């Protein structure tokens, strides 16, 4: 079932995660999509200089993360999305897109 | 409950991560562990000088893998682990280990 993992890596203005992270709560359409499993938004430890987020993304394929970026719903995710080159008041100083295939997964 | 996330970032030989992931399939008990959620064993794509594998593991609390890392099941499933200097046939060149707090998860 969980074969691929997409991972959105967000560096952030120090001290502006938890705002960011409040903001998955809300869903936006990507539950509707079979080939979606799940998602865990993580913040990393001992980060200096900026915010490190995270957004993992469990897919049953890569075709299913590849429709999903295409789709109305990651539009509607993102409708009000922007970065600080876009906005000067966004925390988002830089994104990174990194994927992978999941070779292994057990969830107790 | 999934509060916490350790990852142990695996850099090995090109062509080995199968032969390695495989290896996951085999539990030594961190099943048995209260704090333990779940494990995603992942290989990053489109890495050209070496393959990358990570070990992704959510627990309850940080105090929950802490306690693993000292445990003995750490140790049944280390044991027989080495890095390429300890044993120059091993394709483990270098490892990272990174930690976060989970602040948002969903399971489909
Ligand atoms: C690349 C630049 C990106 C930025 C700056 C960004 C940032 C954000 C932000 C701030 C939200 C919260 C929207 C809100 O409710 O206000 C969001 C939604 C979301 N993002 Fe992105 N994101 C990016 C791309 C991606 C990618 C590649 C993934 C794939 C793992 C991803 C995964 C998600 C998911 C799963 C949601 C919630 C979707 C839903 O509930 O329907 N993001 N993103
Ligand atoms: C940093 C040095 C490490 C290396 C080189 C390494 C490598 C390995 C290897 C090759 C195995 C498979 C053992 C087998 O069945 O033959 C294994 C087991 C495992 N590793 Fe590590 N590992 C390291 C540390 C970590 C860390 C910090 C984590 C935390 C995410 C981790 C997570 C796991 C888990 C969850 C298992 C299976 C445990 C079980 O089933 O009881 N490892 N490791």
């Given at each position: 079932?969980?074969?691929?993992?997409?991972?959105?890596?967000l560096?952030?203005?120090?001290?502006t995660?938890?705002?960011?992270?409040?903001?998955?709560?809300?869903?936006?359409?990507?539950?509707?999509?079979?080939?979606?499993?799940?998602?865990?938004?993580?913040?990393?430890?001992?980060?200096?200089?900026?915010?490190?987020?995270?957004?993992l993304?469990?897919?049953?394929?890569?075709?299913?993360?590849?429709?999903?970026?295409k789709?109305?719903?990651?539009?509607?995710?993102?409708?009000?999305?922007?970065?600080?080159?876009?906005?000067?008041?966004?925390?988002?100083?830089?994104?990174?897109?990194?994927?992978?295939?999941?070779?292994?997964?057990?969830?107790?």
């Amino acid at each position: 079932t969980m074969k691929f993992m997409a991972e959105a890596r967000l560096t952030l203005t120090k001290g502006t995660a938890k705002d960011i992270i409040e903001r998955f709560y809300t869903r936006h359409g990507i539950e509707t999509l079979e080939g979606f499993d799940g998602m865990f938004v993580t913040q990393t430890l001992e980060q200096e200089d900026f915010d490190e987020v995270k957004i993992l993304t469990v897919w049953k394929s890569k075709q299913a993360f590849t429709d999903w970026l295409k789709s109305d719903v990651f539009k509607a995710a993102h409708k009000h999305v922007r970065s600080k080159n876009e906005d000067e008041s966004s925390p988002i100083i830089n994104n990174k897109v990194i994927t992978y295939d999941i070779g292994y997964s057990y969830m107790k």
